[PDB]
Amino acid sequence: GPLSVFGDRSTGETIRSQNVMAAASIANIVKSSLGPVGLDKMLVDDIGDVTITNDGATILKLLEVEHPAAKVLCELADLQDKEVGDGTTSVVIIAAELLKNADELVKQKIHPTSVISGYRLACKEAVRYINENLIVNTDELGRDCLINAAKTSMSSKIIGINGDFFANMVVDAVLAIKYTDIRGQPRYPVNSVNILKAHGRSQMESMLISGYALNCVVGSQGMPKRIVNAKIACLDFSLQKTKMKLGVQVVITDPEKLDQIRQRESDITKERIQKILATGANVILTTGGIDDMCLKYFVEAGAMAVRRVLKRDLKRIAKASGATILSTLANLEGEETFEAAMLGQAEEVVQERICDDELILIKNTKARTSASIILRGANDFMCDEMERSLHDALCVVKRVLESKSVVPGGGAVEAALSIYLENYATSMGSREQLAIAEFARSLLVIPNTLAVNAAQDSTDLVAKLRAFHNEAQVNPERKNLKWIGLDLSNGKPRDNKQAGVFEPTIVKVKSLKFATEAAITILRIDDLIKLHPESKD
Amino acid sequence: MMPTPVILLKEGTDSSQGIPQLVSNISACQVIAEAVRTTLGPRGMDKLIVDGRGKATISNDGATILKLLDVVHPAAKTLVDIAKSQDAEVGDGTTSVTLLAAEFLKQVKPYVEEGLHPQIIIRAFRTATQLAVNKIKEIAVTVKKADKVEQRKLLEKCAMTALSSKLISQQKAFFAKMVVDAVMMLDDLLQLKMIGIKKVQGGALEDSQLVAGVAFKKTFSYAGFEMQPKKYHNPKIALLNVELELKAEKDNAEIRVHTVEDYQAIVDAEWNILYDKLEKIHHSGAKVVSSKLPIGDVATQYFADRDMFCAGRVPEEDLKRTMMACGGSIQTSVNALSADVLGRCQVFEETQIGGERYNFFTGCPKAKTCTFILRGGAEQFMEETERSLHDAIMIVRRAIKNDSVVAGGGAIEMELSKYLRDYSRTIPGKQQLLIGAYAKALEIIPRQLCDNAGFDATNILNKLRARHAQGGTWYGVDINNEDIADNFEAFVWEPAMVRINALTAASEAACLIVSVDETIKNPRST
Amino acid sequence: HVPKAPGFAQMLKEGAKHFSGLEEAVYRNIQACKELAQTTRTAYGPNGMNKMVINHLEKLFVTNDAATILRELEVQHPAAKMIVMASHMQEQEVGDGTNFVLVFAGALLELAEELLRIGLSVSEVIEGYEIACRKAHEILPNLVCCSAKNLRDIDEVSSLLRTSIMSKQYGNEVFLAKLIAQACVSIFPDSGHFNVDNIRVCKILGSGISSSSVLHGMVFKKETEGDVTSVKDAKIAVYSCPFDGMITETKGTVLIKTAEELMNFSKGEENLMDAQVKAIADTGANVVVTGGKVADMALHYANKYNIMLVRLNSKWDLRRLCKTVGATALPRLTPPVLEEMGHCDSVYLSEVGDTQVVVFKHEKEDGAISTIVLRGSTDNLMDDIERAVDDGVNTFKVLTRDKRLVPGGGATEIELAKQITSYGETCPGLEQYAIKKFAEAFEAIPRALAENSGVKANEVISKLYAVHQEGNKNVGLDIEAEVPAVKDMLEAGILDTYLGKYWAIKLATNAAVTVLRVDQIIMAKPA
Amino acid sequence: TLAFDEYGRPFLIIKDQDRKSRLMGLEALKSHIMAAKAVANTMRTSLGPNGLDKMMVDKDGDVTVTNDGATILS
Ligand SMILES: Nc1ncnc2c1ncn2[C@@H]1O[C@H](COP(=O)(O)OP(=O)(O)O)[C@@H](O)[C@H]1O
Ligand SMILES: Nc1ncnc2c1ncn2[C@@H]1O[C@H](COP(=O)(O)OP(=O)(O)O)[C@@H](O)[C@H]1O
Ligand SMILES: Nc1ncnc2c1ncn2[C@@H]1O[C@H](COP(=O)(O)OP(=O)(O)O)[C@@H](O)[C@H]1O
């Protein structure tokens, strides 16, 4: 008679109501961590680890989910870090409210393919309207655009101070790693900034190290820990005793030739260490291993040798100091040449005190003048929060300098799109106009969440918010009310042009493209079959 | 991990707080509204609920379905009590009260998640309800030519729509004619105990009938009932409350005798006590005897020899209907029997309807009661037919004392959305998002008339909002044709107090769900 | 390996715990009573929220009154029971202000924790609270501005009863004020004792609150067992014996010795019952109400002589019927009633809300007793209006005992916060800190009124002290809309229970003092 | 989801809802036909003068061979 599957089958409006409650179970979590009045959470594990964070990606990655519609919204937050980097609480609330308003349409016996086709006409028109209603590029504002866009990202986190201490350190970090490319591409690789953590003084003592901050120790306590006018030798091979390979064995037939082979394992080893040290090299960085026999040659000659450094850290030092990453001997059948003209340069390599640990600093690197940020917090829970908040702040200034276009934040984009799409649904709307009209109400949840978390008036402040944006579209008298946002500290609509509340363009363009595409896949689960777990057979 | 005291809070109780509590109450009312959602409209199906004992009850009434779900949710019990009060006040407002009260919470469900302290929602719900119950009274039509054939036609149209959405398809013209004729035979009290609805298994719905008199089920008799033939052209009924047995003992009598000459005189006196009571029933014309107390083998054979009929162990609910049918009086003592206490009928026979025997009375013109015998093919079929009969009786019971009727279907629920949206555009403040949300919540009654049979319900609401804003105010949803139609001209009528008590009970239930902010449950459940 | 700490001096219990000191006993009693103050803080005021409380009997109670919530919550903390029994004494004394006790004594213990952790011990916070409590009873007669004396009729008490109604029924403040005005004034004893037990509530399930009314009489929920339901003369003979005859007491045994005594016993018993029913029919009686059962022979002659029978199974409802129609319950069998007959106007039956009721409706002589017939959509709604009805009857008994009133709505607690602070600054001692903390407990009572209205309590409490500059003494809170700009309470008419404010301050002070006296707690094993 | 809310609260409507069975779907009408056709296919072979009888065994072990449709289904 029925289906003889050994799992479970649920059809109809059961799964159509379960996917909305699965998406609302995720959105109601992250609704309390949006905007400058948002608050952080606690993520406690079974082993006892506590993670205090408010970013939309760190919470949903550590949180376990079971529903298939819940894994779509959790993987939607992971894509926002790679594509944009701060846009990762706002996408989850929009994509869940896109399913909440579309559930009210399919309960009115409206076909979901008209809602899918109605959402594509509203998503492509939202990108078209936001690209024709921008204020200015990065020429008029200058450095004031980079600082004000950085403070908007920090307002939802622990580094949202009233001053410009953390804002100036981010702009000075991205501007110091300007790496040009072919065909006129000024790239800004923000992954080259080594963000370090140390439980020390307050947040106002966060050092901006112009150069690189290596997270390693010297090793042997007989080397000079401060070298002025240093020459960095970046190399990746273990400075240990000469061990033969698997194909080579030592089969001796004469007992007199025994001790000459035993001394040869250290003579070939020390032959490399004398030709890399006679060329003026004082700092040697190694990703392999330097044993206790080879540490004597640096104490005797007065050189610094750092062992077991990361491979991702050696590439950031050799590119910034002009050093060449050498793995072995080379240069056309040469015995030991080392190409001594390709040594790195540094002004000062100094191991400072980082509150009961050792940290090596390189000052200005003499070739590229890179930057590294050492964070200072109260405990380890604040340092993990300060690292995530700084990494999201580095991604904001990266997209502004690459794509010179900013949009007003604080719900100013979602207020203008809530009224333009209602007029867009009336012109060319015959049967898909109800999906475009619900696309505007789903976008209004971003200024609605700012009024809930601020404990302000909800149905009056957003009603006063769209009152200025309606007059900016139907009354062409140059009212300039396209930048009207929210003042959550006062509870009144303010102008985000003069207040300095700036967000990048692709933090809302890619947010509206990812949330609309995720809402289509969850809208097509009218039939769902769940099989039994095959564990013990 | 937070609460670890030495002395706990109360015992172990959990309590939600704030905005997650209120959405938990609104979404709970949406689940219990699905059990009355598919039972609306003439194209609405019924539901079958089986309990733990295995008893099946198939019905579509809101007062029958919601009482068998065994709902233990605190907020969802509010929608069950308004379905019970609608059956107690009106009788046919049941599925519409539960579903409309759930829409009052779902239309404010995006509003309660974003601010909007609920004292503004309670004030807006009470304001829109008082304007809704006043526009019904100002538009409900009435007549000034009653006590004629036109008033009986008004009672028949309200009973056909009350018999709609039931298990009756083509028997609307047959059953609803009997419902109007049932309440017109009653007195000026309209008591529901003055009409017997008895279910006889076997026969179609066309085999049912409305007896002008009464009829009982012919309960357990004794030897002598195959005699006493059932042909009476003008009998008299003796309603009694006495025992006609030889063993009538007062349970405290000790008859101490001394000799054998007086011992036989006691046994002869015990037969003379019973035979003197039978001589009082005799010599008075009372050929039919009815008593709620049992009759032994002695008085059964005495009436068979004197060509008299009797019936013992009659239920007390049937003797009260028998007293108002024949116009007599129940006499406990047989010494005061006369012509003023006996009944009078014309046709009294014992038929064989459905296999079981039934002693029916007919022919009495001064009949203040009636009996509607139901014939069906199943026990659950006749229980639904009895439940559908009570909804048509309680509609026509209230229609006599208040003949103000309105249009059926979604005609009133759509035009109340017109008068409330026009009122919401004339007041400032936050009430434009609440009075207008109250008007959009009333549009689900024409939605469930269409969603149960397709009908393209999105396009049919654009025709309803355009017709009510242009011309008449009684345009609703046609069931046979997939179009809008004037329900007042199509004789789809319902009394005005059906929708007045529906809007009043749904608003007071919706104001109670939004007013509770904490729910504390004690774990002691024994 | 790992050692452990054993018992030291007096560990002799078999599973019981022990508390001693300030941190283990005194500070934990404060934090337990603070959780009850924060629980009922949301349900306090006219904008309070209801609470669906389920007891151990698995039934639902939804209300906003703090007295009926604590009766269903199974509280197990011992110091938390002291603030519950103090609120239960407010219901027994005046019947209103039970929640005022939880806010004031919850703030008295909370501010006492700030004094024990900064300063003086319990020997001076208790003595400091008692000085400010005696001074608080000297300002309350000075804050009386109006009185319930002139025109004691249904017009003046319709406005003086709105404050007790709007605190629990905000939208129905106009309908319930008129229903409590036509019931409490109609049972006036002509300058005597006002009994609150003479007002009953008949819950009839049906339509909404607009169809509720007050009937001058009593409404029961039983049947007739007869056909004489239309009674217009209404001469009621009330009996307490079972209306089935006169039986003996010890054993009871019919002794038959001949055939004549057996045949005449059944006919002689019917003639004996016939003479007793016709003895009360010749006296003009129409309604015969009994307490016990009624035999079939009594029902035979009740319908013959055309008299109505009423069955009352409850013995307490029979005594209320004697005060309704003015009769006397006779313990013996039916006599010729000389002067203890009842006299009503119309006794009939009607099925209202699918419930056949018996109504003893008085038409001309209206004032003997009153019964408010409440209508509701749910049974849970009618229990909440009944609590609001009983708060209106209990407020009418307060105005009988003392006709003085004080302006509520936050106006009284600010003036009590200003005068106690004036006494605290003029006290040259170390106990002046507890006097200043006693006035701040009155400051938190209009704070709960503003937090329940969605208004910021910092700007609300700042405007109250700014307009109380030594001569106003009447401005309270305007909770009708946001951005309040608060108005006068005498112009709005928000003033209630001066005697309620006199007892709620005294009970909450003695409750908070009794908690601070507890220094050592010895509990037993719960079983 | 079932038996849980989106805010983490337990979502209990009726008592013992985990051990309940509810079908609205499109197979609720299909389950009524397949249950009624198997009764009609059983009684199809016992129709007419060539209708074969059925052997009915009671709970007490009594065996009654019946052909009329009233006693078979009862
Ligand atoms: N000063 C401000 N005024 C108003 N709104 C602000 C201000 N600063 C930040 N916001 C709002 O707070 C929101 C924070 O979003 P966020 O959680 O950072 O997104 P994502 O998770 O993608 O990084 C932004 O959408 C922005 O509109
Ligand atoms: N002939 C008809 N045409 C259109 N609609 C009808 C017709 N007959 C009944 N209806 C609709 O069916 C609905 C049945 O409601 P019902 O379930 O009886 O309410 P309740 O449960 O309160 O008795 C009515 O609201 C009415 O509008
Ligand atoms: N119209 C009004 N305006 C302002 N405040 C009011 C109004 N009506 C009542 N209140 C306030 O609501 C509070 C209700 O207190 P209540 O809970 O009745 O105390 P109790 O529990 O002792 O009866 C009162 O203290 C009063 O100040």
Ligand SMILES: [Mg+2]
């Ligand atoms: Mg009160």
